[PDB]
């Protein structure tokens, strides 16, 4: 009983079948727990039980049609390697219950990592529980927090509610008695300054000046509460509210990233279409023959504009200046949110993320990180110099020019 060998996109083996004894082979992972949750492993048997193992299950025994066939994933191993050393690290070094990382290619819209932490040895699965088994990139939702506000702008300038160069009174002001209020509390901020300091007065404002199904069609486009579509098992499409009469604090609310459970994977792809100029590609696993065509979703103008102003947020000023990386420009958005138990309540756990593009020139990635309970630690959050380590050494071994002046 024989199986096939699927590789990375260049050819670096992911999971072989090597001989054990005379004919009978057994099946071997070399990348280990590096793709743990996403390769899979088999039983006894040469049967798919997780990963690409089982959701490629017939096509690489190919009984009945034909002989066995390999299959050459969308990963690439040089950044798949990065990515869960600087995650998994990370989530040690926070003393963090999980962690997950999703990195995207823009143009096509090809996963190129897509990392767990803590992981698993498919090797020899003794002594491995299951709650460190199932892929949390896909499996888990979490509310997205402020990784939605360049949404918000987009629809806000291209539904004529604010130009570019408008200034928005941020002053705490009470939403039929919710205290709207900034940590830093700012008499006034720019169209740009409101992403710089993720002031939810600002956006606030913005989602009340327009109807509540702009931001519900907006977050929609860019794949919001729709399924990614790649054959793994466990893949969740997120929590999506399908309401029709809204309030004046749910308004607020969904404008603050609140109110939706999206998974990791969904929100890469989210920052996939950011980095496309509003491009939305379909998700792959596996390589794709280019070119992907996709389809325009929102206006180039106004995504490459809200692209440029998410730069502050690495720049002296912003919350993520933590997440800079030497010699480029990139266009993030960091913050910290609050758990959500099985009772639907806030519990007194946090939730660290990270999600950005790169270059600001021209992106070619998209990058997720994820850092789920940072326990010990300090906010001021702990994502942030995580995505600049996994994207500084993605642009490098990807080598792309640098951006900004040194």
Do not use: C
């Not at 180039?300 to 912003?318: D, F, K, N, Q, Y």
Request: hydrophobic fraction near 40%; charge should be positive.
């Amino acid at each position: 009983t024989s199986r096939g060998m699927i590789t990375d996109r260049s050819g670096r083996p992911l999971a072989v079948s090597v001989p054990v004894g005379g004919g009978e082979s057994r099946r071997y992972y070399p990348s280990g727990e590096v793709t743990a949750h996403l390769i899979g492993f088999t039983n006894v048997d040469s049967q798919g039980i997780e990963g690409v193992e089982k959701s490629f299950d017939k096509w690489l025994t190919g009984q009945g049609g034909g002989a066995a066939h390999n299959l050459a994933l969308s990963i690439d191993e040089r950044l798949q390697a990065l990515v869960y050393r600087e995650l998994n690290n990370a989530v040690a070094f926070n003393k963090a219950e999980s962690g997950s990382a999703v990195l995207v290619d823009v143009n096509t819209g090809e996963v190129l990592a897509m990392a767990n932490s803590p992981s698993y040895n498919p090797n020899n699965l003794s002594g491995t529980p299951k709650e460190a088994m199932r892929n949390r990139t896909i499996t888990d939702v979490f509310e997205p927090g402020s990784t939605v506000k360049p949404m918000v702008v987009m629809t806000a300038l291209q539904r004529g509610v604010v130009r570019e160069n408008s200034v928005l009174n941020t002053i705490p002001y009470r939403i039929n008695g919710h205290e709207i209020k900034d940590v830093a509390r700012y008499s006034e901020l720019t169209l740009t300054g409101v992403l710089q300091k993720s002031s939810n007065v600002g956006v606030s404002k913005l989602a009340l000046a327009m109807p509540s199904s702009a931001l519900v069609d907006t977050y929609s486009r860019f794949g919001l509460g729709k399924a990614t579509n790649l054959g793994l098992v466990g893949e969740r499409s997120g929590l999506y509210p399908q309401k029709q009469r809204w309030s004046d604090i749910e308004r607020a609310t969904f404008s603050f990233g609140y109110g939706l459970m999206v998974t990791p994977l969904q929100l890469a792809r989210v920052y996939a279409t950011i980095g496309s100029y509003g491009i939305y590609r379909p998700l792959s696993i596996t390589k794709v023959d280019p070119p992907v065509p996709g389809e325009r979703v929102f206006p180039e103008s106004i995504v490459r504009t809200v692209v440029h102003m998410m730069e502050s947020v690495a720049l002296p000023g912003g919350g993520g200046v933590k997440a800079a990386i030497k010699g480029y420009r990139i266009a993030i958005k960091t913050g910290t949110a609050k758990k959500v138990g099985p009772d639907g309540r806030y519990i007194n756990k946090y939730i660290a993320y990270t999600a950005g593009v790169a270059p600001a020139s021209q992106p070619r990635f998209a990058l997720v990180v994820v850092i789920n309970d940072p326990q010990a630690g300090k906010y001021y959050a702990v994502s942030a110099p995580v995505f600049g380590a996994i994207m500084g050494g993605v642009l490098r071994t990807m080598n792309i020019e640098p951006d900004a002046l040194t």
